[PDB]
Amino acid sequence: HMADKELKFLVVDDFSTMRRIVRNLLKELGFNNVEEAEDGVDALNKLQAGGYGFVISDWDMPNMDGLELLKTIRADGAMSALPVLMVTAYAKKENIIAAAQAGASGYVVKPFTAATLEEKLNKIFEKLGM
Ligand code: BEF
Ligand SMILES: [Mn+2]
User: Fold this and answer.
1) How many domains are there within the chain?
2) Per-residue burial over 20-58, b = 16 or more CB atoms within 10 Å of its CB, e = otherwise
3) Treating both helix axes as pointing N-terminal to C-terminal, what angle do 16-28 and 114-128 enclose, rounded to 10 degrees?
4) Which numbered atom of ligand 1 lies nearest the CA of 18?
5) Nearest CA to ligand 1 atom 4
6) Rounded to whole angstroms, how far apart are CA atoms 81 and 72?
7) Helix, strand, or coil (residue 33)
8) Ligand 2 center from residue 122 Cα (angstroms)
9) 38: domain range?
10) Pocket test residue of 68, 110, 117 for ligand 1, highest count of atoms within 8 A of CB
């Protein structure tokens, strides 16, 4: 998948407020193909629905937390290379390490600015040649 306007995003967070910030930011960046999920399980259900080219995910969520969601994606042969950008309030280095090692594409700490989100998505695009 390429970082054109068609790229389909899944935005995962247990708080709609954060999902809403991220969707609106993506729109501003020219990405309108965006769906939401409320937790890791819901997210896996949509991911299984097919078509997604990028995940942005919270960490602390009921049902399945985002570290589990990230690991699950990375271990699944059908989606193991799916970009996953963590966006979370967890700021300790051990958290950043656990997610990095689990294969996170990137990591943004809440609260974040619009410029930061844009910068970190662009870094992932460049890295993967999207
Ligand atoms: F709830 Be998230 F991890 F900020
Ligand atoms: Mn949360």
Assistant:
1) 1
2) ebbbebbeeeebeebbbbbbbebbbebbeeeebbbbbbb
3) 70
4) 4
5) 88
6) 11
7) coil
8) 24
9) 1-130
10) 110
The binding-site residues of ligand 1, defined as CB within 6 angstroms of any ligand atom, are 58-60, 88-90, 110
> SS3 breakdown of the chain: % helix, strand, coil, rounded to 5?
45, 15, 40
CA of 62 to the centre of ligand 2 (A): 8
- Write the CATH number for 23: 3.40.50.2300
Amino acid identity for residue 113 in this structure: T
The coordinates were experimentally obtained by X-ray
| Residue type for position 53 | G
Phi then psi for residue 89, to 5 deg, are -75, -15
Q: Which residue has the tokens 């690991």?
A: 71
Alpha-carbon distance of 54 to 25, in angstroms, equals 15
Supply 29's token pair: 């960046």
